[PDB]
DNA sequence: ACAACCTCCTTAGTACATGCAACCATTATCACCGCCAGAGGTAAAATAGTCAACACGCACGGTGTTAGATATTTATCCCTTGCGGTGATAGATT
């Protein structure tokens, strides 16, 4: 799919299909107000707007 | 009249900062032994008592029966799963 006929002027990307710019990484304690020897993941996740 | 100066004299004033680990010995040296103190000993009687006797009297614990609880069994019920249909989201615009 790369030996198709391509004019003098069809400029050529990537799979370009997601815009995320951040994800990031913690861990400290869940919020189960009760059941609490248990921790929680964190991942502070960053875009272009398109998604939340 | 003293002044400091030439020389090697000796004296002696100091030697940066933070922290952790280890354990606490060596001496010899007559203390004599005489006296007597209150002061050690203990017999006999105060400050008072033991524990064995024969009584007294009670608590506790183990054997027995009873009680009821619990963990099992059974079976019911609901809350949950996973997929699916199609939801008004996300967010761009009005």
Same mark, same amino acid.
């Given at each position: 799919? @790369? !030996? /198709? !006929? ?6 050529? %990307?990537?799979?370009? #299909?997601?815009? %995320? !710019?951040?994800? &990031? #990484?913690?861990? @400290?304690? &869940?919020? %189960?107000?009760?059941? *609490? /020897?248990?921790?929680?993941? %964190?991942?502070?996740? @960053? *875009?272009?707007? *398109?998604?939340?």
């Amino acid at each position: 799919s @790369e !030996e /198709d !006929e391509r004019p003098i002027g069809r400029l050529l %990307v990537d799979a370009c #299909y997601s815009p %995320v !710019e951040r994800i &990031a #990484y913690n861990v @400290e304690a &869940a919020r %189960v107000e009760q059941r *609490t /020897d248990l921790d929680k993941l %964190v991942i502070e996740m @960053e *875009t272009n707007g *398109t998604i939340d």
